[model samples]
Target: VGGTRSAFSNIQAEDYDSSYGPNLQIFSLPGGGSAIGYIENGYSTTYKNIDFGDGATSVTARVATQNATTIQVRLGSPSGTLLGTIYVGSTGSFDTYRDVSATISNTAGVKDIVLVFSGPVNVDWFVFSKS
Candidate 1:
């Protein structure tokens, strides 16, 4: 338990942008709760001012989608250098949640990490850990 962050718990729709509609949406989840949903194909979100302390080794996301997609992590700007890619596969159903993990380049210090969705996806949350 070094470092961890979540999209639903740690991020918001006002953090980033999208090419089409309003990037990722904060909506209702199952059993009376909220989640980041309606994530379009070209949507991008960021967790601002994150202090990695040592460094971030990996990124993970709890997502639900019927179609396959790719979650790209970039440092600084949205089109910045690619840190990693989380291959998002169909999790049986659109409401079924699954965790997608990907190794990222060890980046030190504090910075804004951007998440770009290459396809339609519904992300419950995203986690970043320094391992």
Candidate 2:
């Protein structure tokens, strides 16, 4: 099993949450709802207390960006051990959504994951999957 966090704006501790720096802002998605946008370079968002249940093999994210952006995944803390990096190329437009994923080391229990945006990126949600 896995967990998906759709609304980045409204977050609870047990399910999933995000902490971002100054360069981030909330933007609406093309089809319907909202997403976090205006993410400047070096901006980072940390997802804390993410319970993987048994373990998670990969982390998937729905992102939208016009330029190439690097999304770095870290375990424990933002500067903690590196899990994986998902290089998200241009998706044509900021409103266009695309799925990006990276293989992560499996963990048995709860852990904090950080998404460090190396460039401008808009994130819809993130999912931690076990398969």
Candidate 3:
């Protein structure tokens, strides 16, 4: 979310079939428009996805929340290749804040990419970006 061109777990390349990761390459963020969140536990939540190019070199996404299971994240390509996924657990817990990064070489050269989130369980902040 913070940096660009990174990978993560849950959606390992070896387990692409059952993965729901995002893709920054094909992601269509607003022109110079970045995302932000300020929700707290038992409040609003946010999760999302980005579509990277066919195969990006380095891409990363970060999820910050009071509860680890408050939201879910993903990184993948148009081909449905899951790069990473993380399930937020609970609020004010030790596993609240997490960063999902991935390195996509095999999915390079492709034009379609997408990143998706399943909203938030509590109050949290999440960001997505790529290089």
Candidate 4:
């Protein structure tokens, strides 16, 4: 169904397994780890060898932004199959991160994932659920 960098919950946005983009930028999070930032429309990151475990009912991303945007979950390439989309609403500040989620169709197994951004947003991490 879908792919995730995390085993159960939490994937470091800065530690994207692999990537191919023009302005894929990342900065250190004040909270300790690094976060994916400076995302432009159509920017994307790749995550390979992900396990959904028993299956994730939904996916969540730790994000912060000043403008509302959508993160498209694609199966493989940037133009891969769309699994779902997570809306990133303005949390007020770039450091004011919040958890955002959307239901997905990944029921089990491993797969590579590509997350494409429709606008600017700061992503601290993302997760795959088993519920």
Candidate 5:
């Protein structure tokens, strides 16, 4: 029995358990990193069995895009319980990653999280926090 769970969990966007919509791909970035790209409107990705434990206040993501967009944080199904929405603004270039965060509510216990995109954006990683 070894389980020292963390309140903050960093999850790579490309490491999604499952995904939906058209042309969702994990692609290589310039320099030396991998990001989830080719995202269109309504594209969604699922993260399985994340234990938020208690009182997760926010979710942060590393995102890059030319246009401003949003990512819906949902629970269970693609259009399940809405937790929060991460608003992403243009980081000048699509290859330039920046940190964006959203305040979340009712994000406790173990649950499968879904990220539903609003427009074209590249995602590097995301993390949930209790603080």
Candidate 6:
């Protein structure tokens, strides 16, 4: 089924320059796009870069779990377009981290990157970066 594009367009974290971190830049893209980096407390966690597959679509996100269980992430786009999602493992008792990349092929206008939790959860610290 096709879903509607709610106020959940792009994440608020992606707005404004120099708002997230020192090196990330959020350019404009139709449907949606994102670049992010995650840190595990004092440690440095990294997500590999993504390429806009043959089209004008480029998207990316990252999640680090405090456990070892699996969690689902939903990518929201404009209304009436098909939504994209991914399942990540944040198992039961270990530290797990995932860097995700996505592309929207048929969306119109700008899009927002969001986190759809399968269940209740918590976040320590998350950051966004772009080039």
Question: How much lDDT does each candidate structure score?
Answer: 0.72, 0.72, 0.34, 0.83, 0.86, 0.32
TM-score per candidate, chains pooled: 0.79, 0.81, 0.32, 0.89, 0.90, 0.32
**Residue pairs whose backbone atoms clash in candidate 5:** none
Best by TM-score: 5
Estimate candidate 1's alpha-carbon lDDT, on a 0 to 1 scale: 0.72
Clash pairs (backbone) in predicted model 2? none
RMSD of each: 4.5, 4.8, 11.5, 3.6, 2.4, 13.3
Question: Which portions of model 2 show Cα errors greater than 4 Å?
Answer: 1-18
Model with the higher lDDT, candidate 4 or 6: 4
Candidate 1, position 21, lDDT: 49
Per-candidate clash tally: 1, 0, 53, 0, 0, 11
Q: Output the number of the lDDT-best candidate.
A: 5
State the lDDT of candidate 6 residue by residue for 6-110, as single tens digits.
Answer: 222223333322222333333332334443323222211121221222223433444444443222222341122333433444534223334544443433333
Query: What's the C-alpha lDDT at position 125 in model 3?
Result: 25
Once model 5 is optimally superposed onto the true structure by TM-score, how far is the C-alpha of residue 99 displaced, in angstroms? 0.2
Candidate 3 residue lDDT tens string, 22-55: 3211122233222333322222111223234354
Scored by lDDT, model 5 comes in at: 0.86
Per-residue alpha-carbon lDDT of candidate 4 for residues 8-126, written as tens digits (9 for 90 to 100): 75777787777766887888877788889888888889878777766777889999999999999888789988888999999999899999999887646777878899988999989
Residue clash pairs of candidate 4? none
Over 1-131, each residue of candidate 5 has an lDDT whose tens digit, in order, gives: 52433437678788788999678888897777689988998899998877788769889999999999999999997889998999999999988999998898858887888999999999998998864
Model 5 lDDT-worst window of ten:
1-10
